[PDB]
Amino acid sequence: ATRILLLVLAVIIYGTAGFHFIEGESWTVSLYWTFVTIATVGYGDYSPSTPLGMYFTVTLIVLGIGTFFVAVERLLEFLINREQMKLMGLIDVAKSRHVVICGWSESTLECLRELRGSEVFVLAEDENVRKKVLRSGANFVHGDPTRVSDLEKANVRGARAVIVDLESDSETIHCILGIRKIDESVRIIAEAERYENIEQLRMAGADQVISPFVISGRLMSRSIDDGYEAMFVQDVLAEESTRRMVEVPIPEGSKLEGVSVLDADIHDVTGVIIIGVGRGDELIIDPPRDYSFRAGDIILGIGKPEEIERLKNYISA
Amino acid sequence: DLEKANVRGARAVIVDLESDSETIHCILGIRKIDESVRIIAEAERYENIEQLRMAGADQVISPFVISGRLMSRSIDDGYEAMFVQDVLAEESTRRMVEVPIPEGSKLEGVSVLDADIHDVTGVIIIGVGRGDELIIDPPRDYSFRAGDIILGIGKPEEIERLKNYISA
Amino acid sequence: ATRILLLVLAVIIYGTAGFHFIEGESWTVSLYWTFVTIATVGYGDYSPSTPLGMYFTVTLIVLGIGTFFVAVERLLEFLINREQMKLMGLIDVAKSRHVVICGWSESTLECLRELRGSEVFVLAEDENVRKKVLRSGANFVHGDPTRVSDLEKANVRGARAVIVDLESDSETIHCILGIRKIDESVRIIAEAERYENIEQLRMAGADQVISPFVISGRLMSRSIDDGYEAMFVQDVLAEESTRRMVEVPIPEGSKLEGVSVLDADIHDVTGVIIIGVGRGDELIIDPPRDYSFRAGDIILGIGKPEEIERLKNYISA
Amino acid sequence: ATRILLLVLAVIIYGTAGFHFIEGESWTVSLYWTFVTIATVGYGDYSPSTPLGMYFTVTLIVLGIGTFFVAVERLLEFLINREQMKLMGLIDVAKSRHVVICGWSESTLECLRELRGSEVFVLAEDENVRKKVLRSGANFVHGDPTRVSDLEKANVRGARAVIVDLESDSETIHCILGIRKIDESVRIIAEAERYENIEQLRMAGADQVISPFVISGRLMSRSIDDGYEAMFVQDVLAEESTRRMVEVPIPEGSKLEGVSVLDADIHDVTGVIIIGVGRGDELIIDPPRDYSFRAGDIILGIGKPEEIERLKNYISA
Amino acid sequence: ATRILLLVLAVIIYGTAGFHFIEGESWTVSLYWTFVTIATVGYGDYSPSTPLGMYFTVTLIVLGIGTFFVAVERLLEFLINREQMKLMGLIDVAKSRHVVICGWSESTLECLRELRGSEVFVLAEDENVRKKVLRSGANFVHGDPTRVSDLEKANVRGARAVIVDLESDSETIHCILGIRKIDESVRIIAEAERYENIEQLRMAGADQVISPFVISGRLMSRSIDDGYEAMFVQDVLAEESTRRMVEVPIPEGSKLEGVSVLDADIHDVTGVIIIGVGRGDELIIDPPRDYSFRAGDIILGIGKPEEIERLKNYISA
Numbered sequence A, C, D, E: 001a002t003r004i005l006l007l008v009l010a011v012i013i014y015g016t017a018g019f020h021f022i023e024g025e026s027w028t029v030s031l032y033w034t035f036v037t038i039a040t041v042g043y044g045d046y047s048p049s050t051p052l053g054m055y056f057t058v059t060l061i062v063l064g065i066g067t068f069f070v071a072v073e074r075l076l077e078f079l080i081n082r083e084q085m086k087l088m089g090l091i092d093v094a095k096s097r098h099v100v101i102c103g104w105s106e107s108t109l110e111c112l113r114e115l116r117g118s119e120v121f122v123l124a125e126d127e128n129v130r131k132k133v134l135r136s137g138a139n140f141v142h143g144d145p146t147r148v149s150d151l152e153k154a155n156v157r158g159a160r161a162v163i164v165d166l167e168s169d170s171e172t173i174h175c176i177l178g179i180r181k182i183d184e185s186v187r188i189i190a191e192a193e194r195y196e197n198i199e200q201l202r203m204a205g206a207d208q209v210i211s212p213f214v215i216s217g218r219l220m221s222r223s224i225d226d227g228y229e230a231m232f233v234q235d236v237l238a239e240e241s242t243r244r245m246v247e248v249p250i251p252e253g254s255k256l257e258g259v260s261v262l263d264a265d266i267h268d269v270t271g272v273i274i275i276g277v278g279r280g281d282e283l284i285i286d287p288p289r290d291y292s293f294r295a296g297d298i299i300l301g302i303g304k305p306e307e308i309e310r311l312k313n314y315i316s317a
Numbered sequence B: 001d002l003e004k005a006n007v008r009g010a011r012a013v014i015v016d017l018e019s020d021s022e023t024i025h026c027i028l029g030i031r032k033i034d035e036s037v038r039i040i041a042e043a044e045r046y047e048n049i050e051q052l053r054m055a056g057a058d059q060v061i062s063p064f065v066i067s068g069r070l071m072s073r074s075i076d077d078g079y080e081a082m083f084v085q086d087v088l089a090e091e092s093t094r095r096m097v098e099v100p101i102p103e104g105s106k107l108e109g110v111s112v113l114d115a116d117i118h119d120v121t122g123v124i125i126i127g128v129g130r131g132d133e134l135i136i137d138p139p140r141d142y143s144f145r146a147g148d149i150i151l152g153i154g155k156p157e158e159i160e161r162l163k164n165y166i167s168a
């Protein structure tokens, strides 16, 4: 630790005092000679001719070599210990705008393909998960997501968003309760498995709940005969082969602040089917004709990629 | 073992196994047994959708892909997730309905533009499908026939009105 | 090992003898020149002008570089081997006032929050336990607590106290029998699971036995109707929301040595309910009125944090 | 990363400018003195006599030692991290004529005894497989053979051949479908277990299918009474005790291009039983008498090792 | 590998040739100056005054630093790789008088307390066995004892003795068959579990067979009523509380070569009960009176430790 610095100054005092009172040189010269001898620069312009001084250099050289080996001994121990700890997690996140993911599955792998790698930290405990996370370019933190103490290691207090996807709904509910105990304003996205636990996640404090098993079950039972709505879901929400559901905000000005939806006539002018308007953390599906657009509103619609561009320029001032 | 379950001569077969490899193998075996049976499979990885389609699956569902795309897009806004969760999972207010067109009921030979379905029933017409093919957002130069299926979103009070409107 | 030191002196003899009998310099100069050449200080005031001496320096330099690389080869091997061993335990405890914990559970995690980290050594064998111990700030020793040979690795002979909490009561009894075979005076604290094994731990040599499963079972069966005593236990022994059970010793003097419990009137003067007195490794619950306090006695009572201070100053001389 | 190079040039500018404007030496001398001071060569022919210059050397030496320790700090971190990654796979194959083996079993061990070690890369995921591969002299790549992303890590696009042998036929079929999605021309050799899946491997795109379980089952049921054909298979295809099945190509010229099989009379002249001819990725078992040899044809036959040599020289021009 | 040596000589040629043809010094001086510049000794008695030579030193110094860093890069990679391999076995035994132990159990731990640590190599494959072996002071080799290839890694061909104790008798028989295929003269000691497999181990080639389960089963069924013979076995063969069974050879001379057992009267003179005589790899239990001792014979007897000494001096010439 700090004992190395004390040892370095100890040998400096011994070299400077001995050379000063043996060769009769000045203090500014003895200090200069000590630094050019320990560093082994060796200018040789102030060599000690006295045989007693020669033995003083021999013991000074021995101490110089010893202080070099202890410096390497401490440096090697610090680096080996730090790399072993960092390899298996056991570290504290220092970022302040990262995204924390609790658990690891195929859905969490899908969302990494649309986000940065160094910005995402994965909090898990299994040994096999660590190798999968590393191959994806993300960061791995070793801990228990249901433990409040381990939730502070990932630094969820200053996190941009938290995504919870664990093995069971019991662990998902417990993880959300622990996050709300630390930070009451962070955004939480959670995945549900059973239909009965959808309301339990909202009571825990989840901002958005996604239930992929419920959606898949209903589509299976309704695709036995015709299954036309399963084609719409697969080709728009999953594959985006020809259509895509997008949400574009209304900027300041936007040439249409105040006009009604009927007057705008978005579908005929652009070609995008309007689903709803996002007025302040709520969705108004199929808004009435007397709805007037405002600033900062979000329009949800479905359209071709060459028609969405026709809409963004249409709402741009 | 697939012959013990009597997969030959059935309404449909639903395949949902622990991995995509087992699903592909099961679909291949079913196609070996019966060639005309309807198969509904579930995909886990995005890269295996085309593999399932080539194996012989008639309908492929990928909930993991949908969940991952909604997770990454809900960080900032998350309004699409609200729509999906309210119209496909919970069906709290609206739900997607597919109502077939019966024979000779007020709609044989009428175009989309003069049908005015949305302004008289309130159901948003997502698309119309005929012959295992879905036409999303049909153009006004389209004619309704007997047997066509209309895919739309509306309240239960509006679905009944639409069904009455499409009745003879 | 020690072959490095022999090699270092071997090259010193070769350099000093060759320079002495070739350049004609004195022994005190040849020894000085050898040390300023191997260390690569290079004053240059005694350079060998003879071409034969120049070749003698070339072979001396080659040996100097070789001895430097073998020194680094041995240092690196020693550090890498030591860090790999220490990472997975495999070390002997050298402390003499530490606390040894056998096994790992939630109860042992609770007692670490009231003790030092570097003072506690955990003796376990599972791989997952090692990571939990490290995150708590304690030290991990790899061994079998039921093995007497591994009990000496943790140095239980000179331990301040030993806490035993294993997976089964069979292992807890076996561990206590092994500790009493090494040291017959060390203090042992053990946790029991079954009610029938409470006496078996005392016969093995356990000084204090704690049975949390028996206490929890009786409270569950008596809390079906009213459960008022469960509120007392939870609010005093577990949470300490408003009350706390404390034990304060009687120092020398203490202004009350010799007075009776009736004369003291602790409850009215202070406000702490007196439960018993700890007279020499025994508890006298509800002492009689004819009980006279002595020096070194311990009073067990329940009171508010602002009333316990009123009692400590009342018994302080 | 690249911050080390910037730091090295930073201290060079400080040393050169200070010595130039303090000791009055030329720029070509200050640059020469800076390089002979940081490297600690120390010629000593331009020592600074000015006491202010001596303090300038002291701070220059301190920066020289600091830049040396940061260079070792970065070198050690790079080497330790790289060795830890390479030890457990997590690397990308850069070869372009290697052989990729998916899975590990006894059959894949048999084919390694007839191939090079550094030319073969094994793609697996189990921890115990890695040690077996290393003892065989091959290379280990950590990944999932059924994952297309991990199939590109092994670089199957530019592979000489791919051998697939996994735990189940479901995984074998899935692996072949993933290889054909990357490269449509690479040669795939796969092993089947069930007889019903032999055609499924060919539809997936396997060039050669081997079914050892089907061959062994038929031999077991036909060896109950006599089992003479099992002796032929074991002594020719497995052990090669006295016979061996070989295929020799027909080179350009070959003294027999155009002659019929009847005219050649291979069996009487040489002593090798002729089984078939490999005319362009097909096998003609027992060719008719009107078959004329061509250039590049392959003859499949059974004969003693001293008779195969009699055949190769017989077909050599 | 060997590319480092080529690089070291490459920079030597560049430094020597440039200094020779620029400063006009002799070849023996240019070679001397090159070695005192790369090693950074820096005598400074042949500094290049020419400015062109100064730039030649700058590029020579840069190459000197580069060759030093590549030497450290190769040394570090060699040491880190070797230590990682040696830590988890993966090494070949080079000893020629060691003892090889196949498998690990409590019986094999008992025999290590009477043998050297560095002389014993344990051949196993489990991960938990490696830590137990290291704590006992023995050496661990990673391999499969039933594999002939792994039996040559432990070097059983030149082994003093081999001890086989595996999980099942099927593996014990298979291991012995593999040892006899390598070396037909090495001594094999094997432990049997089932009584029916005692003869199977002898047919495999085991020199000595020990069956602890059979001995324990018979003692259990005969100790229900009295069990006096179990006391004899426990107090003589296991604990040696007061008696001990010993075998002492007859040296050359021995003052009794040729006398009969009746004439010797060992029991009355010494006090040791004579059980048998080991005449050439056979045991004659209760020898007849007409038995005459020879040279090299071994006497098996039971006696107190103070009576065995009375026998060794009685048979010593």
Ligand SMILES: [C][C][C][C][C]N([C][C][C][C][C])([C][C][C][C][C])[C][C][C][C][C]
Binding pocket: A038, A039, A040, A065, A068, C038, C039, C040, C065, C068, D038, D039, D040, D065, D068, E038, E039, E040, E065, E068
């Ligand atoms: C080749 C060889 C060389 C070496 C030298 N050094 C110096 C350093 C000092 C600092 C303090 C080392 C020495 C040690 C003792 C012997 C290094 C250098 C490198 C470059 C800079």
Ligand SMILES: [K+]
Binding pocket: A039, A040, A041, C039, C040, C041, D039, D040, D041, E039, E040, E041
């Ligand atoms: K130096």
Ligand SMILES: [K+]
Binding pocket: A040, A041, A042, C040, C041, C042, D040, D041, D042, E040, E041, E042
């Ligand atoms: K120097």
